[PDB]
Amino acid sequence: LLSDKNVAIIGGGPVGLTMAKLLQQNGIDVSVYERDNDREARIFGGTLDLHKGSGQEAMKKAGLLQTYYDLALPMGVNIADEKGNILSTKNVKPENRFDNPEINRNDLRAILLNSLENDTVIWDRKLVMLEPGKKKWTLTFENKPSETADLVILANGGMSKVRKFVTDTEVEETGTFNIQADIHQPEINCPGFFQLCNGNRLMASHQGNLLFANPNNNGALHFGISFKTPDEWTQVDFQNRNSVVDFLLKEFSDWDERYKELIHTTLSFVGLATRIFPLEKPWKSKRPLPITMIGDAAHLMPPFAGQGVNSGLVDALILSDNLADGKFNSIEEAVKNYEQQMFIYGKEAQEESTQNEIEMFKPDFTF
Ligand SMILES: Cc1cc2nc3c(=O)[nH]c(=O)nc-3n(C[C@H](O)[C@H](O)[C@H](O)COP(=O)(O)OP(=O)(O)OC[C@H]3O[C@@H](n4cnc5c(N)ncnc54)[C@H](O)[C@@H]3O)c2cc1C
Numbered sequence: 001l002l003s004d005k006n007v008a009i010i011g012g013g014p015v016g017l018t019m020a021k022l023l024q025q026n027g028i029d030v031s032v033y034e035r036d037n038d039r040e041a042r043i044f045g046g047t048l049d050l051h052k053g054s055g056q057e058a059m060k061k062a063g064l065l066q067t068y069y070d071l072a073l074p075m076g077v078n079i080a081d082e083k084g085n086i087l088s089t090k091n092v093k094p095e096n097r098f099d100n101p102e103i104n105r106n107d108l109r110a111i112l113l114n115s116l117e118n119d120t121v122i123w124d125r126k127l128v129m130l131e132p133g134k135k136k137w138t139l140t141f142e143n144k145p146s147e148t149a150d151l152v153i154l155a156n157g158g159m160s161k162v163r164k165f166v167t168d169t170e171v172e173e174t175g176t177f178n179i180q181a182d183i184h185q186p187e188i189n190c191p192g193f194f195q196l197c198n199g200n201r202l203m204a205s206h207q208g209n210l211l212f213a214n215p216n217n218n219g220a221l222h223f224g225i226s227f228k229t230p231d232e233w234t235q236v237d238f239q240n241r242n243s244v245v246d247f248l249l250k251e252f253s254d255w256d257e258r259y260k261e262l263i264h265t266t267l268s269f270v271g272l273a274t275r276i277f278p279l280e281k282p283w284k285s286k287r288p289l290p291i292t293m294i295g296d297a298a299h300l301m302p303p304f305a306g307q308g309v310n311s312g313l314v315d316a317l318i319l320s321d322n323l324a325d326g327k328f329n330s331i332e333e334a335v336k337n338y339e340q341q342m343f344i345y346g347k348e349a350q351e352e353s354t355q356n357e358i359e360m361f362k363p364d365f366t367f
Contacts, residue, residue, distance in 0.1 A: 001326030001334065002028045008139060008149035010127045010162070012036065014048065014105070015295025015312035016155030017112035020120055021062045022320035031149075032116075033125035033141065035156075039113060044270060045180070046222045047073075047214055048108060049100035051310045056099055058313035067111050072101030073216065076200035082207075083256035088200065102201075104218045130162055132288035151331060153319070154293040155312075158277055158300030165291050167283045174302055174354070176274040176361055177229045179244065181266040186221035189265045192258035194221065204259075208363040209251055210304075211259065223262065226304070227251065228361050229273065238271040274302050276354065279346045283339060290331040292339065294319060299346040305356035307349045315342055 007023055009016045012034030023030040050056045050068060059065040074096040079087040103111075113121065129140035136148040154160050159171060186194040196202060197215035204211045213223035225248065236247045248263045277300035292298075295312030318341050322334040359365065 001328070001331070002151070002323055005150035006030065006148075007151045007153065008033060008137070008147065009153045009155050010139075010160075011154065011156030011295075011297070012109070012113075012121050012123075013155060013157060013295060014108055014112065014309055015316055016153075017109065017116070017121070018058050018062060018313055019153060019155055019294060019316040019320060021064075021112060021115050022058070022316055023323065024116060024120065025062070026320070026324035028324070030120065031147075032121040033127055033139070033147070034121055034123055035126040036123060038123050039110075039121070043105040043109065044182075045105055046212075046224070047102035047104055047217050048309050049102050049306075050313070052097075052099035055310040055313040058317045061317055062112075062115060064111055064115055068103060068108070069097060069101065071107045071111060072103040074101040075214070075216070078197065078200040078202045080196060080202055080204040082204060082254055082259070085196070090200070102214065102217075107218070127156065127162055130165060130291075132165070135289075137289055137291070150290065152289075152291045154291070154297040155295050156297055158275060158296035160293070160297040163293060163297065165284070165287055166293055167281070169278065169281055169283075171275050171277050171300065173229070174274045174276050174357060175229055176226055176302065176304075176357055177233075178224050178226045178272050178274060179238075179248070180222070180224045180270045180272070181268065182217075183221040183223070183262065183265055184219075186215055190221065190258075190262045193262045196258060197221075205360070205365050205367065206254065208361055208365075210360060210365075213262075225251075226274070226361075236271065238269055241266070241268055244269040244271070274357070276301050276350065279343055279350060282343075287332075290335060292319065292335045294342075298342060299350060301350045301353045302357045303353070304360055305353050307353045311345060311349050314345065318342065 007030040009019050009032045012032045016032055020030050020032045059068045074091040076090040078085055126142045128142050131138045136150055137152050139147045183189050194215055202213045208227055210226045215221045237243050252259055279299055294315035301307055319338040322338050328334040
């Protein structure tokens with residue numbers, strides 16, 4: 001069905017790599033083009049969890065489920081107030097897989113890279129332009145040679161700049177904001193907070209500020225602090241830790257000294273406005289050549305209720321199935337069938353995550 005043709009996947013994130021695996025095991029000629037300089041670039045961020053109905057099915061189909069298990073870490077969850085423990089959910093043996101053991105993002109990338117043929121991924125390839133010819137797409141990469149493909153699949157994350165051939169829809173700010181950071185040797189550097197987590201992930205919520213932490217992302221503590229974007233903003237400079245620290249200490253002034261120590265001990269902060277790529281309009285039905293989008297490039301949405309990578313791993317599973325099992329007259333029809341399913345579960349996910357974002361940031365999230 002892709003028989004004399006090649007596929008370009010733009011983006012080597014967890015969705016794009018998984019797309020590449022599911023394609024390539026059915027004999028399809030696929031390359032992944034990834035902006036990262038090389039395979040050891042550090043991926044900033046929290047862990048990912050794969051769920052039994054969805055992301056784990058992608059891994060199962062790719063023959064990687066067990067490997068995901070070996071490298072992932074089941075974790076309990078503690079809910080605390082702006083000082084003490086209000087709920088402690090330890091993981092039980094029936095449930096350690098039950099979905100969603102946590103995996104570090106570089107571990108998962110390495111699992112997916114290792115399952116691919118040599119030179120599937122081409123590193124240091126930032127796609128900046130796409131142009132449809134007669135039969136193939138010309139792909140333009142910053143300061144590197146151009147390439148062609150019969151089929152382009154954008155897997156290049158929520159801020160993709162190269163969507164216009166699929167849709168004119170734009171990314172939108174949802175009105176919340178997230179500040180993230182990593183603390184190394186947390187047992188040493190934020191002891192009181194590290195002891196509160198006590199090996200579990202921790203969430204706490206107070207007066208419209210939410211705090212999420214994982215004390216054990218390959219030995220580093222990762223945390224995020226989220227809140228409704230201040231009307232005043234922008235006004236904090238994430239380059240200057242002092243201005244981020246002043247802002248956070250003001251917002252957290254009520255909170256126990258263990259949380260403040262977390263803010264004090266952080267070397268640098270990454271600030272990011274929450275965004276959604278809304279599945280609001282149908283995508284374009286006149287496309288000059290086959291092209292589609294999966295993962296956050298298709299349906300970026302707030303992460304607060306756990307939605308995120310699982311639905312992108314389902315995208316990969318449904319699209320590769322449609323392209324391989326070839327029950328369709330054409331690639332075009334294969335893509336359209338995928339996009340139709342994806343609009344349904346993708347909209348359900350977005351509604352739940354928008355509704356959850358509203359519910360959480362209500363300043364009186366009791367909750
Ligand atoms: C703060 C926060 C916490 C989150 N927590 C969770 C969670 O707990 N659970 C969950 O499931 N999801 C969570 N998510 C969502 C989750 O991270 C994403 O859904 C997931 O990473 C998307 O996978 P992806 O492959 O589509 O995109 P990405 O991970 O964004 O990867 C896209 C890849 O494309 C590469 N790329 C970008 N531009 C180009 C270019 N022009 N050319 C070539 N390559 C390019 C990038 O380097 C990147 O490797 C969270 C998101 C945020 C923001």
